[PDB]
């Protein structure tokens, strides 16, 4: 009479699944169980998250000190998990779903904020955004490996970029900003706004 595990998965991927008629409940247990099996398959295919063991333990202690699993407790767990993610400078991280494999196993789905594209926007002295790929080759270097597509965005990597390029003295204003990628669900665009001196 309890809850045995909290899994925490990171989800981007894609899904199918179709449907059918002739709903003999005797049978339609077929579909409603194929969905459970597919969910288990997804939970194993999925990538584990950045949550460390101490915070897993704290969430599980919250879950044990309250025998029954209530939605308010899930809200508090979400608050704690997002607190950890943001404390480590994972600004874009967010919980999106609380699934179940059975009433005893809770599945928390997070979007960590993976980087899908790198964007460098140049602005002329007066702030009017202009084009120009003469500085792009040098600004591509002096960028941490961790800002490239294939990593989870962290504000610390943003600060490292903001200082490496800062050291060249080529811009009067440097900003690194994550933005929600409209072409990808949960993906993040790292845009780097550079404003020139004079």
């Amino acid at each position: 009479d309890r809850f045995r595990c909290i899994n925490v998965g990171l989800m981007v991927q894609s899904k199918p699944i179709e449907m059918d008629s002739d709903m003999t409940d005797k049978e339609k247990l077929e579909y409603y169980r194929s969905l459970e099996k597919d969910y288990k398959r997804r939970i194993d295919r999925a990538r584990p998250c950045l949550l460390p063991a101490p915070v897993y333990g704290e969430v599980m202690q919250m879950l044990r000190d309250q025998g029954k699993v209530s939605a308010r407790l899930l809200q508090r767990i979400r608050d704690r998990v997002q607190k950890w993610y943001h404390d480590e400078g994972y600004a874009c991280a967010q919980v999106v779903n609380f699934g179940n494999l059975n009433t005893k196993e809770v599945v928390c789905e997070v979007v960590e904020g993976d980087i899908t594209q790198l964007v460098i926007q140049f602005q002329d002295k007066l702030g009017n955004v202009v084009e120009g790929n003469t500085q792009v080759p040098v600004v591509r270097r002096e960028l941490p490996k961790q800002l490239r597509q294939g990593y989870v965005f962290n504000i610390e990597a943003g600060k490292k970029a903001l200082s490496n390029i800062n050291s060249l003295g080529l811009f009067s204003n440097i900003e690194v900003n994550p933005r929600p990628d409209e072409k990808n669900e949960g993906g993040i665009i790292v845009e780097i706004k550079l404003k020139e001196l004079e």
Partner: antibody
Amino acid sequence: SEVQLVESGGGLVQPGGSLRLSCAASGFNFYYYSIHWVRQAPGKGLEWVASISPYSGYTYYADSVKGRFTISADTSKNTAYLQMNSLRAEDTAVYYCARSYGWATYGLDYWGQGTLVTVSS
Amino acid sequence: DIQMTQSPSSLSASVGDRVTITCRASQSVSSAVAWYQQKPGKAPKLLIYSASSLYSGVPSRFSGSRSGTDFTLTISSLQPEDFATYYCQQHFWELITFGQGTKVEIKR
């Protein structure tokens, strides 16, 4: 193939009274499903009131009803029940009984016919 | 508390239009959203069980779609038999929450 729900009980009661509603489960095996009670006020929206967990006997109630209603189920006759106590006028509604497979992750597919509970002096 | 905001309260449409009803969860906590159609004097019927999955024996004109905390029910060519009230519903574990409803009426 599509054998369905009948809500029984329900009627007129006075403020402070009590009532018990039955819900007869014909054609499905309500271990794999969860039984929920939802009430619709006169000419108003839908409001979830109570739920029972599949397999295990975990009981969940809405805060508007907590402390006066108790959900239950008899596995033998394929039945679920809803006990209403310290009844108030705001409980006047139609009371539906509907199943959802699994726990808290799928849709209320098969609903009942309904039953009216009028709470008036 | 978790709260769905369903909009519009009512819309008027003609037979053949593509109608879109949206409802928004107050927090990103659950993708377990369902769509129901209820005609007056009767019991609600299930249209959409997962956030976008078409339920059995429902006509193909009904569609579901999700964008963050935004859920959308969509009818391609409104038939006469689709004039009713529509409700969206979410499963935050025990918290079963319904939208306020959308009444689909005849344009005139």
